[PDB]
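User: Predict the full complex structure for these chains.
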Amino acid sequence: LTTEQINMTKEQKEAQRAQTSDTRTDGTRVAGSVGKQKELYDQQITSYKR
Amino acid sequence: ATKAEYALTKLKLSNESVTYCTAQYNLSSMLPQQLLMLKNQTTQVAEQTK
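Assistant: Here is the predicted structure of the two-chain assembly.
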């Protein structure tokens, strides 16, 4: 069970790293739910300007 | 009184005999099993360190 908690800790770290950073620990761009959420803000920002 | 004391010494052999068998069982069974218990605990400490 301790070994399994290692993976969860790593994944929860990525969720924290989603803030204040656009890249994960390995360097790839975030694309999950938080990545989709940011794209919605970009469209909304353009919508308000338009 | 000496005869009564002789019976007490004679009967005391039973306690010594069962003690030897009890100690023999502990060495043959309990001690090796405890060693396996300690080894698993040692591995858990490293995982918690990780």
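The CA atoms of residues 17 and 35 of chain B lie 27 Å apart.
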